[PDB]
Amino acid sequence: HMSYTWTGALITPCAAEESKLPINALSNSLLRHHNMVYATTSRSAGLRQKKVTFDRLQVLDDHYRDVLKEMKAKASTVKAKLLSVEEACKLTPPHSAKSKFGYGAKDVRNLSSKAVNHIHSVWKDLLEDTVTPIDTTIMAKNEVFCVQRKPARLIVFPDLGVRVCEKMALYDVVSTLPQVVMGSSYGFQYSPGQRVEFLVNTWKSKKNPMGFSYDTRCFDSTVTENDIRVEESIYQCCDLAPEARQAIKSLTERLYIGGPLTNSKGQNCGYRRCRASGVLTTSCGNTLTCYLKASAACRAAKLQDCTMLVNGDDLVVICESAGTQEDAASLRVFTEAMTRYSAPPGDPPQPEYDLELITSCSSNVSVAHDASGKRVYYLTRDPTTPLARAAWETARHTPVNSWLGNIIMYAPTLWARMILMTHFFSILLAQEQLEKALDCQIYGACYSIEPLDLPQIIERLHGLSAFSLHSYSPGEINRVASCLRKLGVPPLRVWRHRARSVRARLLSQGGRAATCGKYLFNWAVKTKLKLTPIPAASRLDLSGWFVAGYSGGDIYH
Ligand SMILES: COc1c(C(C)(C)C)cc(-c2ccc[nH]c2=O)c2ncc(N3CC[C@H](CNS(C)(=O)=O)C3)cc12
Numbered sequence: 001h002m003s004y005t006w007t008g009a010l011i012t013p014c015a016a017e018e019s020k021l022p023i024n025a026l027s028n029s030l031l032r033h034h035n036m037v038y039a040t041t042s043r044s045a046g047l048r049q050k051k052v053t054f055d056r057l058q059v060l061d062d063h064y065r066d067v068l069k070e071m072k073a074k075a076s077t078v079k080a081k082l083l084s085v086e087e088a089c090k091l092t093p094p095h096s097a098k099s100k101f102g103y104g105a106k107d108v109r110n111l112s113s114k115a116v117n118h119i120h121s122v123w124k125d126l127l128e129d130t131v132t133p134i135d136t137t138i139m140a141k142n143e144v145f146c147v148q149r150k151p152a153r154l155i156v157f158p159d160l161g162v163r164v165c166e167k168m169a170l171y172d173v174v175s176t177l178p179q180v181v182m183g184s185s186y187g188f189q190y191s192p193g194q195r196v197e198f199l200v201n202t203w204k205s206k207k208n209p210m211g212f213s214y215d216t217r218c219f220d221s222t223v224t225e226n227d228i229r230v231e232e233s234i235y236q237c238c239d240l241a242p243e244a245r246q247a248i249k250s251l252t253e254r255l256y257i258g259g260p261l262t263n264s265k266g267q268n269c270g271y272r273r274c275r276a277s278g279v280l281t282t283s284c285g286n287t288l289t290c291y292l293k294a295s296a297a298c299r300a301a302k303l304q305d306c307t308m309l310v311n312g313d314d315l316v317v318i319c320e321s322a323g324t325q326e327d328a329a330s331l332r333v334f335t336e337a338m339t340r341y342s343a344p345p346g347d348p349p350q351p352e353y354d355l356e357l358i359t360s361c362s363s364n365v366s367v368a369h370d371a372s373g374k375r376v377y378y379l380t381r382d383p384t385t386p387l388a389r390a391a392w393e394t395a396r397h398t399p400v401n402s403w404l405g406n407i408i409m410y411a412p413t414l415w416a417r418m419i420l421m422t423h424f425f426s427i428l429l430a431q432e433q434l435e436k437a438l439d440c441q442i443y444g445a446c447y448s449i450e451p452l453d454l455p456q457i458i459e460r461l462h463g464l465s466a467f468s469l470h471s472y473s474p475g476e477i478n479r480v481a482s483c484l485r486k487l488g489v490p491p492l493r494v495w496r497h498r499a500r501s502v503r504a505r506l507l508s509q510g511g512r513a514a515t516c517g518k519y520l521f522n523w524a525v526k527t528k529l530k531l532t533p534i535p536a537a538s539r540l541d542l543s544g545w546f547v548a549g550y551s552g553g554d555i556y557h
Contacts, residue, residue, distance in 0.1 A: 001055050001056045001057070001224070001273070002053065002054070002055055002056075002273060003052060003053055003054055003055075003056060003221040003222075003272075003273060003274040004049070004052060004053045004221070004261075004270055004271065004272055004273065004274065005270050005271045005273075006049060006053070006269060006270035007267075007268050007269055007270050009263060009267040009268060009269045009270075010042075010045070010046070010263065010269075011042050011045035011046075011049070011138055011139065011140050011154070011263055011269060012042060012263045012264045012265050012267075013041065013042040013139075013140070013264065014139070014264045017039075017041035017042060017043070017142060018039060018041075018142075019038055019039050019040075019041050019043075020038070020039075021034050021035075021037040021038065021039075021391060021392060021395075022392070022395040022396050023395060024394065024395040026394045026395065026427060027391065027394055027395055029423070029490070030387075030390065030391055030394055030419075030423055030489065030490075031387065031388075031391040031487050031488055031489055032487075032488025032489075033486070033487050033488035034391075035147075036146050036147050036388075036486070036487060036488075037144065037145075037146055037147075037388045037391050037392065037487075038144070038145060038146075038147060038149060039142050039143065039144045039145075039392065040140065040141065040142060040143050040145070040149075040150060040151065040152035040153065041140060041142060041152060042139070042140035042152060043140075044140070044149070044151040044152045045140040045151065045152050045154065046151075047151035048140070048151040048152055048153065048154055049154075051151070051218065052154065052218050052220075052221045052274075053221075054221065056221075056222060056224050056274075056342045057342065058224055058226055058340070058341065058342040059340040059341075060226075060341065061296070061300070061340075063296035063297075063299040063300050063337075064292070064293070064296040064341060066296070066299070067292055067295045067296045067299070068230065068292060071181050071234060071288070071291075071292060072233070072234060072237050074180055074181045075177060075180065075181050075234045075235075075237035075238060076237040076238070077180060078173070078176055078177050078180050078237070078238040078239065079238065079239040080172040080173045080176060080177070080238045080239070080240055080244065081172045081241075082168060082169065082172075082240075082241040082243060082244045083167055083168045083171050083172065084168070085111075085116055085119055085120065085164070085168070086111060087167075087168075088119075088164045088165075088167035088168045088171065089108050089109060089111055089115070089116070089119075089164060090109065090556075091167050091171065091555055091556055091557075092105050092108045092109055092160075092163070092164065092167075092554065092556060093105060093439075093446045093554060093555070093556040094106060094109060094556070095399040095439075096108070096160060096163070096554055096556075097137070097157065097160060098160060099115070099118065099159050099160040099161055100159055101118050101159070101161060102114060103115040103118065103160070104160075105160065108160065108164060118161050119161055119164045119165065121161075122159075122161040122162055122164075122165050123165050123168065123247070126165055126169075126246070126247045126250045126251065126254075127243060127246050127247065127250070129250065129254070130246075130249060130250045130253050130254065131253060131254070132254055133254055133255075133258070133259040133260055134158050134159075134162055134251075134254045134255040134259055135158065135159070135259065135260060135262055136156050136157055136158050136255075136259055136260070136261055136262065136272070136276060136278075137156070137157055137158075137159075137261075137262055137263070137264065138154060138155075138156050138261040138262065138263060138269050139154070139155050139157075139263075139264060140152035140153070140154060140155075141153045141154070141155050144385075144388050144389045144392045144402075145385055145388055146384045146385065146387075146388040146486070146487065153277075154277065155277050155278045155552065156261065156272055156276040156277055156278050156279075157276065157277075157278030157279065157552075157554075158255055158276075158278075158279065162255065163280070163554050165247065165251075166251060166279065166280035166281070167280060168244075168247070169244050169247035169248055169251065170235070170244075170248060170251070170280050170281060171280065171555075173235055173238060173240075173248075173284075174280060174281060174283070174284035174548060174550075174553070175547055175548045176548075177234070177235070177238065177284065178284055178287050178288065178548060178549075179547075179548070181234070181288065181291075182287070182288075182291050182310060184198070185291065185307070185308045185309060185310055186287065186310065186311070187309050187310060187311030187314070187316075187361075188283075188287075188311045188312075188443050188546065188547070188548050188549040189546055189547065189548075190546055191460070191461045191462075191545070191546045192378075192379050192409055192410075192411075192412075192461055192462060193461055193462045193463060194546070195309075195379060196365060196377050196378060196379055198309070199309070199316075199318070199355065199365055200355070200365065200377050202307045202309075202318045203318055203355045205307075206305060206318065206319070206320050206321075207320060208320060208321040209318060209319075209320070209321065209353070209355070210318070210319055210320070210321035210327055210351050210352065210353060211316065211317060211318040211319070211351075211352050211355065211358045212316075212317055212331060212349040212350060212351055212352060212358065213314070213315060213316050213317075213349065213358055213359055213360040214294065214315040214317065214334075214335075214338065214345060214349050215345055215346045215347055215349075216290070216313060216315075216338070216343045216344070216345060216346070217344055217345060217346035218346075219275070219286060219290070219313035219343070220274055220275040220276075220277055220282075220286075220313075221274045221275070222274070222342050222343050222344070223274050223275035223285070223286070223289060223342075224273075224274070224342055225257050225258070225273065227275075227285075227289050227342070228252065228256045228257045228275070228285065229252065229257070230289070230292070231252075231256075231281070231284075231285045231288055231289065232248060232249065232252040232256070234288060235248050236248065236249070255276070255279065256276070256279065256281060256285070257273075258271065258272050258273045258274070259271070259272060259276075260272075276552075277552045278552045278554070279552065279553070280550075280553045280554070280555075281553075282312075282551060282552040282553060283312050283443075283444055283548070283549035283550055283551045283552070283553055284548070284549070286312045286313045287310055287311060287312055287549065290310050290312070290313055290314075290315055290343070291308065291310045293338055293341040293342075293343050294308060294310065294315050294317070294338070295308065296337065296341065297334045297335075297337035297338045297341065298317065298319075298334065300333060300334070300336075300337035301330045301331070301333040301334035301337060302330065302333075303317070303319045303330060303334065304319055304320035304322065305319055305320045306318075306319045307319065309360070311361065311443075311549055312549050312551055314360055314361050315360070316358060316360040317334075321351070321353065324351065327351040328351060331348075331349050331350070331351060332348075334349070335348060335349060356473075356475070362381050362382070362385070363379050363380065363381045364379070364380060364381065365377055365378075365379060365380075366378060366379075366380045366472070366473055366475075366476050367473055368412070368414075368469035368470065368471060368472045368473070368476075369469065369470055369471040370465040370468050370469065371465075371468040371528075376412075376465045376469060378412035378413065378462070378466075378469070379409075379410070379412075380410065380412075380413045380414075380415075380476060381410065381413075382479060382483065383413075383415040383416075383419075383479075383480060383483050384483050384486070384487070386402065386403070386406045386410070386415070386416075386420070387415070387419065387483060387487055387489060388487070389402040389403070389406075390402070390403045390406075390419075390420060390423065390424075391487075394423070394427070399439060400439055400440060400441050400446070401438045401439060401440050402440075403420055403423075403424050404424075404438050404439075404440035404449060404451070405440040405441050405442060406420055407420050407421055407424070407454065407458075408440065408442065408449070408454070408457055408458070408461065409442070409461075411458040411461065411462050411466045412462050412465070412466040412469050414469075414472050414476060414477065414480055414492075415480050415483075417520070417523060418492055418495040418496065418499065418523070419489065419495055421454075421499075421502075421520050421521070422495050422498050422499045422502055422521075423498075424451075425451075425502050425506065425516065425520070426498065426501075426502050428451055429502065429505050429506070433451075434451055434452055434509075434512075434513055434516075435450065435452060436450075436451075437449060437450045438450075438451065442545060442546075443546070443548070443549045443550060443551070444549050444550035444551030444552065444553055444555065445544070445550040445553075445555040445556070445557050446555065446556045446557065447545075447556075447557050451516075452512040452513065452515075452516060453512075453536075453540075454516060454520065455467075455515050455516060455518075455519040455520060455534055455537075456534050456536045456537040456539075456540055457540065457542075458519075458520075459519075459533065459534055459537045460537055460540055460542055464531055464533065467519045467520065467522055467523075467531050468522065468523075468531065469523075470523070480492070496524055499521050499523075499524035500521075500524050500525065502517075502521060502524075503517045503520075503521035503524050503525065504517070505517075506520075506521070515534070518531070519531055519534070544557045545557075
């Protein structure tokens with residue numbers, strides 16, 4: 001019952017890999033301690049292969065089968081449509097990994113006959129064959145972090161032709177099923193503003209609230225064949241077209257359960273008997289499995305008035321406290337149950353009695369004040385990884401702009417407003433690239449966004465208060481300041497000075513640029529401009545944004 005077996009062949013790159021932070025003329029204005037920033041490469045993949053390779057033991061009790069039966073009853077109310085080739089092709093990112101069969105993502109997006117023909121033959125083969133393991137590529141991801149070094153994460157993905165077929169059979173399932181099965185517990189249905197509201201409302205609804213986050217050590221590797229067959233049995237409860245049922249059963253037996261791993265050089269690296277990180281069902285499967293195991297663990301631990309918030313492999317639980325002794329013992333029993341279900345933790349969970357102390361999705365709730373002095377709750381995170389990635393993106397073009405996603409998702413934060421908006425609007429002004437649409441990810445899905453649309457997007461996700469927050473918490477300020485000293489980032493006063501320049505430059509330009517200057521940099525000036533709602537905010541087609549998670553799912557919206 002090993003998560004992986006290996007041949008000894010190495011995980012190889014597809015191009016030249018840089019691990020050291022690239023430096024240009026704009027680097028120093030953002031970050032001085034360059035040596036602190038690094039990118040993971042395939043050369044550390046051997047260290048990751050060791051960490052993810054282990055035996056899985058699974059003991060399934062009555063709480064587990066009880067929760068499963070309820071999940072299946074809710075799943076039986078779902079009706080899912082089969083997507084056409086064209087529809088599935090349009091969901092493919094432009095920079096998605098090319099096929100081994102002579103076509104790429106642009107060919108798929110342009111509906112080229114060679115791509116469309118191969119997709120049809122892959123589909124027919126899924127319907128005809130339910131036993132042949134589907135080949136996957138194993139690659140090391142190149143992700144940027146600040147030191148204290150993490151080994152590269154591994155991405156396991158089938159061919160582009162299989163990926164388009166997964167969309168046809170399961171895109172509607174993975175987009176509609178989680179919210180039906182989990183209701184309000186499904187976290188990917190919420191914008192950051194709706195998630196804040198949900199958590200504060202849940203925390204308030206308890207007499208003596210207690211909360212914790214459960215961090216499973218390498219979740220993908222803890223996912224067993226049993227778990228993947230349980231997920232398929234959940235998908236099979238839906239009202240599906242007969243071709244979709246057969247494709248789902250085939251994709252499960254041939255791909256989802258496991259299969260051979262091939263490097264970029266076409267060599268066999270070994271065999272996967274756990275979750276693939278680069279399939280359409282990664283996010284949905286992980287969400288369901290985590291919800292199933294955590295809900296059964298909640299029953300085994302006898303947690304009182306339990307409220308969960310699950311999204312992918314990330315889990316937040318809020319419940320009624322029984323005092324620090326009984327809470328510690330309840331969390332030990334919850335951990336023991338999760339361990340038996342093959343989901344042991346990285347760090348053992350800790351009970352928290354202050355909402356602001358619970359960390360999940362690397363985020364925590366914090367408080368600031370609006371223009372009328374009223375308390376406003378927002379989601380924040382340690383700005384180290386966002387700032388390290390922004391330093392990389394200042395000197396190199398990347399297929400996903402993490403700074404853009406970070407401004408969108410963390411717009412109310414002190415660091416996104418003063419540093420990220422200031423730095424990147426300065427770069428866009430100098431290059432006259434304000435109107436150029438940039439790629440970013442929201443819950444694993446890829447989006448092409450125009451920076452000039454940022455004030456309307458932020459209003460819709462966070463409200464106008466996002467442009468007026470002040471009097472941030474001492475804890476938040478100290479965490480931001482501590483990060484700036486560590487990375488060698490200029491103090492917040494320098495950023496204020498730079499923002500007055502960025503704002504004036506945006507205003508001088510009029511139109512949409514002036515709107516950016518007005519709303520995004522109102523914090524920079526003492527004499528504040530009046531921020532009324534934006535007409536274009538209501539015109540925004542923000543559908544598909546907070547519907548589901550698609551991490552590793554190769555989705556473009
Ligand atoms: C819901 O919380 C999140 C927020 C909040 C709302 C806190 C701000 C913001 C982002 C996010 C941040 C920045 C850019 N884009 C984003 O999507 C975000 N991104 C991913 C995410 N995941 C939860 C676990 C998923 C990975 N596990 S897996 C492989 O099993 O699917 C990824 C949660 C997120």
